Amino acid sequence: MDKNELVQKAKLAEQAERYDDMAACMKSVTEQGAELSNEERNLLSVAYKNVVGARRSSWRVVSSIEQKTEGAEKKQQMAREYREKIETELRDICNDVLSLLEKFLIPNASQAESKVFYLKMKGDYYRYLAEVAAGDDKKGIVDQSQQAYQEAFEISKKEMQPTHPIRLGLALNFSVFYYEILNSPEKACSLAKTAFDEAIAELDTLSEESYKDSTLIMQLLRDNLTLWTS
Amino acid sequence: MDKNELVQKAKLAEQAERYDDMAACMKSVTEQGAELSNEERNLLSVAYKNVVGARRSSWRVVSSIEQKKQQMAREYREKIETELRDICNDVLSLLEKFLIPNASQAESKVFYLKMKGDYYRYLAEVAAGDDKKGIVDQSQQAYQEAFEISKKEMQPTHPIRLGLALNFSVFYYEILNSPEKACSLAKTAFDEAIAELDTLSEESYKDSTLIMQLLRDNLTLWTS
Amino acid sequence: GHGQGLLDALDLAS
Amino acid sequence: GLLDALDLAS
């Protein structure tokens, strides 16, 4: 199949809120092996973000029930078994994305912005895997999400302006990895504060077209600092 | 498999918003062939409402785009239509083989006959011009039969009776293009319930009065 | 005043 | 649709 056709189909799927269909169209585009455009990269990312996001949300609800049903034998057993089936689905999806990242997207990325976007994505999906890891596997998974975020972060610090939404979105997600996954409120507030401040100092130079995206992510960084220092 | 374990997993799947798992559980329960309890009946209905409803919502979106490259949208619409017809036929088969013939109480017979009217109504919304009349007829006779029993057996404030009126009125308005019949059915149902508020029950008075609000909201839409 | 799951199960139109 | 594609953590 023709790549343009697959992209038009993925756009229709998005409008129809049919994210499994969207992700399958964009996985087919990625597997033809040409470097994706920004447009195509963003459609791949929106499709998998919704596919994995549904399972994360389900997993949180069933985890919570499994905690709240301690001393309720039937219910807790069934919530455990259901939780384990949703984890299997969520792992398959993350492993799918992580394979696309390694085999196509990261090697093909010609520009630092796209490198950063995909290494951040790799951090994120290893972070999703870390949320559901077996006790034995967890340290190793957490260190894989940290190494991808850190690699993205050193590239973005050298190559992108502090106001760029992809560098700000990396600082957001990597600071949440520090607070939620590494349980480091210090590294989390340090990263979020520094990113916010470095942006503040370049707002005068920011192109008007980016005012909204940049300052929205800066507000989310500060909302987390506020929360985490409370 | 034990029925009670499948119903428990249907309730966890609903909390997780995993309605295809919920539907698979409740269909497996229905296929055991024993009359469903009210709670099982409501779970089977919620599961399928959400399965088919996702496809109705995508169909409306892709139709709107296609009407506003056109070919790609047509074929995507046809694909969603095929899934929607398969889900309707699934429910309609359960209805025919298990649910309607096992229904031993009037309230459940009205509930199921209303469901058969709704699922034919969804098939009508996507019907080939050639099959459309037959499908419209089947929806209307299911709703007409549910209506006569509800009128005989239930109080005008009963939520199943009110929900039947709401859906059958929308059948008249959207599918038969009969807005005076639609308005008259909705207004009578609203008026007959206001005339008997002392019948509202402490178990269901918020369900009854919510459906009455909906009847008046559609009357407002339709008179405006 | 709500029957459990009933309004959702009635798949109300509109 | 960059902000959506960023999959921002809350």
Looking at CA atoms only, how far is residue B62 from chain A in angstroms? 6
C-alpha–C-alpha distance, residues A30 and A36, integer Å = 7
C-alpha–C-alpha distance, residues A69 and A62, integer Å = 11
Contact B221 C14 (CB under 8 A): yes
Q: Any idea which architecture A1-230 has in CATH? A: Up-down Bundle (1.20)
Neighbors of chain C by Cβ distance (3+ pairs < 8 Å): B
C-alpha–C-alpha distance, residues B40 and B30, integer Å = 9
C-alpha–C-alpha distance, residues B46 and B55, integer Å = 15
What would you report as the CA-atom Rg of chain B, rounded to the nearest whole angstrom? 18
Nearest to A62 by CA among A38, A80, A49, A89: A80
The residues, any chain, with a CB within 8 Å of residue B81's CB and separated by 6 or more, are B59, B126
Burial label for A150, CB within 10 Å (0-12, 13-18, 19+), is: middle
8 A C-beta contact, residue B47 and residue B14: yes
Distance between first and last Cα of chain B? 53
CA B176 from centroid of its chain's CA atoms:
17
C-alpha–C-alpha distance, residues A51 and B9, integer Å = 22
Q: What is the largest CA-CA distance in chain D?
A: 17
Nearest to C6 by CA among B45, B98, B4, B94: B45
Experimental method: X-ray
Looking at CA atoms only, how far is residue C13 from chain B in angstroms? 5
What would you report as the CA-atom Rg of chain D, rounded to the nearest whole angstrom? 6
Distance between first and last Cα of chain C? 22
**Chain A residue set in contact with D, beta carbons under 8 Å:** 41-43, 45-46, 49, 120-121, 124, 165-166, 169, 172-173, 176-177, 213, 216-217, 220, 224
Contact A79 B13 (CB under 8 A): no
- Write the CATH number of the domain with boundaries B1-224: 1.20.190.20
Q: Resolution, rounded to a tenth of an Å?
A: 1.5
Interaxial angle between packed helices A165-176 and A138-159, expressed in degrees from 0 to 180 and rounded to the nearest 10: 150
Looking at CA atoms only, how far is residue D2 from chain A in angstroms? 6
Residues of C with Cβ-Cβ distance to B111 under 8 angstroms: 10
Nearest to A122 by CA among A151, A159, A158: A151
Structure tokens given for B103: 């229904």
C-alpha–C-alpha distance, residues A172 and D10, integer Å = 9
